[PDB]
Subunit: 237 residues, 6 copies
């Protein structure tokens, strides 16, 4: 009998800090290239998860799939069953902000959404999906120590990758949303429920307004910046 | 350059009919054990997809991940880029209906949801996520020919696997929803948008109100029934 | 001492199968021209209802008035007090679909709406108003036996006949809604509540986008086809 | 070709003031017992309408059927096509107010609702369905002149006669709603749109909280009071 | 220990009738120029309140600040703690109605809003913020005795003075809202809760569509008219 | 002609950094006891505002009234007309969190709300009212330098001081909201619109759940601690 319907890991197999990204093959890339002593601890549904050490400190990395419902399953389980204390989401994003550019690293303070999941948690009201301040601060300070500039601010998590919605990008730009992605607004309230911590850091692959797009080489540079910031932050958490 | 951001398959690598299930490893099980001549055509993000034949007719099977946002990405791409004509979702479900029991096969005619994705398509109004009548009929007729009883009726697709919502199950039972799952309400409107076809068939693993639960052996038997119905239906579609 | 506040019929005065249309004078025309041994069983509020036989089987026909609140009153009473098992709504509709034309016969699988009644039944969520599959199938098979082509698919039930809403028609057309009327979305959830069956069949009088319109002579012919399909379907139910 | 799809009357056949009630047979009773020089001007769908004189002044009376969608059709047509200036709704109601009793006459100043029709008119915001002040005033003074006490205050128009909603009656009572009915909230905004006038007066048939119910004799007394108030008010309008 | 968190007055220091305006300095001007024996009874938060007599009858005047939340605090306290029976709001307003002009006096019968406060009182439904009919009638009659023409009809209370909302003014004009301000819709339901009375009268300082605006001398003239109407109305209440 | 309808200050009369609190008399106390060379720059509506220096750096202090609509007027004007760059709200709050106590200092990262103002800015979606990270960090370190412990996390801004809402406090506690107040959720999106910065710090006067309450002497100690944290923070901003 598995510890959860979606994870074959035993309790204790996950470290107290987990980095998560949507693509399980990127979780494997992170484990292979940045973790020592790495072991695979889950392969249910292909959602690869790993546990090793980064500069001596135990750390896990696991895929979360695409969209709020998917990350909600995995994060709820990590906090509840596996007793994880901190999850940092790592990924790519689009941007609409006029002063944010392709290749920028975005540290998320809070995330809006077009999902109903947070209204359902707070009697239909506005519940800001808010990153933990110690996690945000650790990402900011790590980036500074690594000499990597960052953008710090709001994300927007959508349920629909293939948006047909007119006027959305313009409103997001007006209020200086810096990242558009699909998961962070589902993660932060789950961390709240469990008295635990979460954050998110993303790299800008596309400017939704100007249509600038990162080259493969720029995506490599940005990814290497982002993952080093996240990894060094875990030593602080 | 991949044909889509989430699929490395070339146009033409997918048959005009695709079976989809949330777990890519179950897609592989279907391809290996029920399709002949199965070839893997996608492994991006571990979301395995295959193309082979059932009784000589080309058929594909691919994972769709968990939740409406995930299936929406994959289905939008299959209809738009790969020119798929028919998607049949296959899976397990819970039930709340007093006349539905563990091991029952459920053929979905329409699906409700707590997602916002369909309100956003229809100016905020009620948009029923409705299965295609030829697909539903093909599934019903296939089951009749295979001597397998079916329940035919409404599903409910939730964004939240780990529900904390009081009164929901009782209202679903009152109106005889037969299946609770997480994806069909996102699939059916995308098929509409592309002038294409979709349906869903599921087997009951759990009764959410009585707490009865299928054993692993029962889940295997149910799966075998369901998949035979779906495969035979594809010959009619 | 009436059995309901809106119906003087005694329990037993209605057959288990009832055809309903908005106009009570059309219910009388159906009863006079297609039922044998028809007896008037209600005239409260002018909402004429009749009971006789069609080809030997008991059948009733009654008006339901205009709009969801009106049909809700009459259908709730028919299922609850009069122990009706099957209601088939018959009527005319508009269409927005590019491939549906005036004079087409539409068999409804599910209906969207701008009403709040179904959100109120399902804790504010999306509750698809869904026709019973056996009823839909009986109507489809009846039309086939009569060599009458049909369109099968979604309707949209509006509270506002004199719409002023910009963009609605275009969105309905985009998702291939085939019929626009005012009642079916209220009928189907009431059938669900009582564990009973309902369906709807309509003929297109107007194309809302192209502005084509049926002549009076064409409306009479369409009506005759539609009512024959429904009557023959009742024999299979 | 009829002047509207629901009314065979010619332009000019309706007086500038129209009394309306849900039951067309009650419209006929009002015409038969209170109008002189009465002629029937509509019988489409059985929705009887009449035009005569009350104490020398032309006055019409017509049924409107049950529910907001039904009255919306007939009232929109009366103001737009028939150039009516004033509609007064007359009917029965329930009450929840602790200081209102069965047999009381209620003059409606504004009406709440669970319908979406008024949100759709005002960009989703709160649009109070508000009676015209001159009409309200004419009803109040007419009652004073006739020595009939009245209750003056808010109504609530519901789409669901067979309510299953918990806590509604208690909230309506807390805010001293005096009448529960099904149509007035749909009438007043249409009058607004046409720069015209509307009101509503109702007699209490039932106390929804205490379950007191008017006897047939009490219903006769209250009806005679209400209709005399309405008729006398028309002379001032 | 103060009688409320926002008011230093002792129980009884307020008359049973209170005029309120947004600007506490204007409340002081009203007390100084129109009340006899006026004494200041509150200065908490600068929200000046006063109690005196007008033509022998006890009357109070107090500021309520800007917006629904502010007036909700002060009015709730006045009705609950200070046992006030009647509150009349006096102020300035904009208009969008084509037949309303700068300097007009508007007597409010009911008020719409973009606030959520009334939906939260009535289980999410439409709750009309409705003025007490005796107050409306007293204001109308007072104006007539003073030979001052008045406009009588709906207001709209917004939370956002600096509106950026497209299409709102056009919709308000189409349904003949005569006044735009920020507080009345919050006042009237609180009066209902306590079984008390409220009304609102304002003078048009700006036409939002034509951009016409009152001169300072005209604003003084209209204010004197409006305040005299309110004062005389208090003698009838 | 005033620079704005609610403020008599000339352009330039406000420093680029402004502390704001609800009570204008508390604004006056802050200016008198903590600013040097303070001059009053506004008295419209009694909403006192002042400008001086703190430790040599220009600084203003002004009241904002009670509730989101009030602070929206003043903050919009300060950012737009007066070209303010940073607003820090200072005040008192309640708490429901089990780990937060009376006298605690709360630094707000983001604020939820039952207001509609932010949905109206983002096409009906969830828009998190989010404090600027540099401001939050300036407040946290200022407290660290002063050896004052702080709580950092979410606030909830309500429109209704006199809440009657069942289950709200329990949900706020479950998700570890640390502060309940009435304004911050309105401030943060306005700062966003103008490309500027805002934050909020409050001291807990009351525990809503335990009913523990600050003595007047304790409120004074906490207020001084909070205000010194804000003042020192302005020197880093």
């Amino acid at each position: 009998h598995m510890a959860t319907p979606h994870n074959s890991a035993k309790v204790g197999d996950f470290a107290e800090t987990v980095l998560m990204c949507g693509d399980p093959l990127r979780a494997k890339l992170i484990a292979d290239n940045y973790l020592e002593n790495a072991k695979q601890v889950n392969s249910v549904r292909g959602m690869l998860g790993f546990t090793g050490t980064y500069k001596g400190k135990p750390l896990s990395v696991m895929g979360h799939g695409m969209g709020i419902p998917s990350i909600s399953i995995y994060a709820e389980e990590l906090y509840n069953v596996y007793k994880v204390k901190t999850i940092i989401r790592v990924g790519t994003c689009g941007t609409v902000d006029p002063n944010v550019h392709v290749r920028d690293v975005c540290i998320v303070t809070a995330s809006g959404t077009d999902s109903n999941v947070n209204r359902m948690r707070l009697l239909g009201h506005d519940f800001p999906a808010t990153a933990n301040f110690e996690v945000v601060s650790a990402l900011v300070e790590s980036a500074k120590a690594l000499n990597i500039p960052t953008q710090v601010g709001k994300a927007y998590s959508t349920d629909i990758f293939y948006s047909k919605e007119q006027g959305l990008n313009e409103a997001l730009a007006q209020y200086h949303f810096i990242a558009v992605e699909m998961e962070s607004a589902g993660l932060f309230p789950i961390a709240d429920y469990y008295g635990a911590r979460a954050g998110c850091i993303c790299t800008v692959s596309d400017h939704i307004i100007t249509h600038e797009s990162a080259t493969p080489e720029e995506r490599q540079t940005s990814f290497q910046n982002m993952i080093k910031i996240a990894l060094e932050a875990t030593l602080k958490l």
